[PDB]
């Protein structure tokens, strides 16, 4: 069992079958070698940040991304989010625009750092958890999808309502995993400029809060702090 450092216990327990799998041993050897030959994002200590900031027991919302940002300083282990001081990437700018129209009083901050969402139960999961600098999809099919489907399954296995937000054709394929009787799927086009017309006006943030309120699960406070510290 190859267990990463500083993971919540409930994740260690739920994901032990993955951490013990032969394919995961192989993935570990591949990434060791990858980090010698290339710059790999995010840095090793950040790869599991989504699970650390949002323990399994605290999951209320799951927002699935594809893989990490692959430019310098961008990815830090959360879907969609970037480190403080980094330019807000296009998809996140569109997310901010939809937030501004969906959530009364929401003001988009200067930064793209979404840690405060993760700290209130929003699991910001990428399907693939590492990438070579500058090459998108470069770690596709190496085991991360198996691993993150196991995360999705463990979340779906909870009895208390979780809202799964599935943006775009790739994330929407996960809908078949969401069989839990209390869960809710919110689905639309991706916020990327390529498909933003199928994202704008879908109000996924108020809809998620309505579902949470109804279940007595506590609506998310979507407003981000105006300035941040790592």
């Amino acid at each position: 069992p190859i267990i990463p450092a500083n993971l919540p216990e409930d994740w260690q327990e739920a994901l032990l079958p993955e951490f013990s799998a032969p394919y995961f041993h192989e993935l570990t050897d591949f990434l060791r070698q990858e980090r010698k030959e290339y710059t790999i994002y995010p840095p090793a200590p950040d790869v599991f940040n989504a699970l650390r900031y949002t323990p399994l027991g605290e999951v209320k919302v799951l927002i699935l991304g594809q893989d990490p940002y692959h430019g310098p300083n961008q990815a830090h282990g959360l879907s969609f989010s970037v480190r403080p001081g980094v330019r807000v990437p296009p998809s996140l700018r569109n997310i901010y625009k939809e937030l501004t129209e969906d959530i009364p009083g929401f003001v988009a901050p200067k930064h793209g750092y979404l840690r405060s969402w993760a700290e209130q139960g929003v699991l910001l999961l990428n399907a693939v958890l590492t990438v070579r600098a500058g090459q998108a999809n470069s770690h596709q099919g190496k085991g991360w999808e198996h691993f993150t489907d196991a995360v999705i399954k463990a979340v779906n296995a909870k009895e208390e309502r979780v809202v799964f937000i599935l943006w775009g054709s790739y994330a929407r394929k996960k809908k078949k995993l969401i069989t839990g009787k209390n869960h809710v799927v919110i689905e639309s086009g991706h916020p990327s400029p390529l498909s933003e017309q199928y994202f704008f006006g879908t109000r996924p943030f108020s809809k998620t809060n309505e579902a949470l309120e109804k279940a007595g699960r506590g609506p998310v406070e979507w407003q981000l702090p105006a300035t941040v510290t790592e």
């Binding site: 990463p4 450092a5 570990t28 990434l31 990858e34 980090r35 090793a44 790869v47 590492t130």
Partner: peptide, 4 residues
């Protein structure tokens, strides 16, 4: 040692 670990790459994650």
């Amino acid at each position: 040692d670990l790459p994650f």
